[PDB]
Ligand binder design. Structure first.
Ligand code: HEM
Length: 293
């Protein structure tokens, strides 16, 4: 009925093989520091791990990270994926170095790596995604719009099986990077620490004096005097009572946020995958720093 995507470990690889890919990404992150005005590739990699995952449809089990379908033109040229080509190029050389790793596994590890190296929480990760054929590539239009309200958000995330808690946690990734006019029709950073993983997003939402304004692309965005921006979908989080209570909690406790995020992010990345009982347990990779590298 609904596809069944069973995880299949890359033949003969163990934990140590994966830690080597991680370190490779990590080391390149450290070295290519000038990207986007010295933000680095951290943020775009996280966005890439979410975009390849965010196409999942719990109704027929199509999309998601399994297939590494972003490799195909259709998914690659999705207007919602504009700008991701930069994370793609960053990863190419690594792929060329470890050609045995599947695409889905690589794109998803890039995100875990980015988060952990940006001082975020540890995100357990599972290997086993298997490249699927060009024809399993989902149509464009499954990624969310930025100009909607909390109702849109709630409904949308439901398709990915995410509840309110998971939604607000995941949304905290909007502390990282920035919007780029040419990519999305939005411009500006979210906050001040744009390449360190913190609960900044929640604080900025609660504490700034947001003004609604139209940008150069004729889109509306919430602008603050500190020079930050919020998309309408971001802002809607304080418009909803249920969401707002969760925003406060995360504003108040970064620890809680980091725990919830971790869980939600793994789930996101594992949606649609069936893990057999003999499948290795999730891996927890060490950071460069933990390894003295
Ligand atoms: C309602 C859901 C979401 C919407 C509408 C949304 C929309 C956007 C937009 C329009 C951009 C700007 C891209 C650009 O102009 O380069 C952006 C950036 C970003 N998004 Fe989302 N996003 C959503 C959820 C998420 C989630 C779940 C994550 C990961 C947990 C995420 C991570 C990021 C990051 C890290 C960036 C910054 C990228 C960079 O600096 O290149 N977003 N988002």
């Amino acid at each position: 009925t609904p596809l069944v995507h069973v995880a299949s470990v890359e033949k003969g690889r163990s934990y140590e093989d994966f830690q080597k890919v991680y370190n490779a990404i990590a080391l390149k992150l450290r070295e290519d520091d000038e990207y986007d005005n010295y933000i680095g590739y951290g943020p775009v990699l996280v966005r890439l791990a979410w975009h390849i995952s965010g196409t999942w449809d719990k109704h027929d089990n199509t999309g998601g990270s399994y297939g590494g379908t972003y490799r195909f033109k259709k998914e690659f040229n999705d207007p919602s994926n504009a700008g991701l080509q930069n994370g793609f190029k960053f990863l190419e050389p690594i792929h060329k170095e470890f050609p045995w790793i599947s695409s889905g596994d690589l794109f998803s590890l890039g995100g875990v790596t980015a988060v952990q190296e940006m001082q975020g929480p540890k995100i357990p990760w599972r290997c086993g995604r298997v490249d699927t054929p060009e024809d399993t590539t989902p149509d464009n239009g499954r990624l969310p719009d930025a100009d909607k309200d909390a109702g849109y958000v709630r409904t949308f995330f439901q398709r990915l099986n995410m509840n309110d808690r998971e939604v607000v946690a995941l949304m905290g990734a909007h502390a990282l990077g920035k919007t780029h006019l040419k990519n999305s029709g939005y411009e500006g950073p979210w906050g001040a620490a744009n390449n360190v993983f913190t609960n900044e997003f929640y604080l900025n939402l609660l504490n700034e004096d947001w003004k609604l304004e139209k940008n150069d692309a004729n889109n509306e965005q919430w602008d603050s005097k500190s020079g930050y921006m919020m998309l309408p979908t971001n802002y809607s989080l304080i418009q909803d009572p249920k969401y707002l209570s969760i925003v406060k909690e995360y504003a108040n406790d970064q620890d809680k946020f980091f725990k919830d995020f971790s869980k939600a992010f793994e789930k996101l990345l594992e949606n649609g995958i069936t893990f057999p009982k003999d499948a290795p347990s999730p891996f927890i990779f060490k950071t460069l720093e933990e390894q003295g590298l």
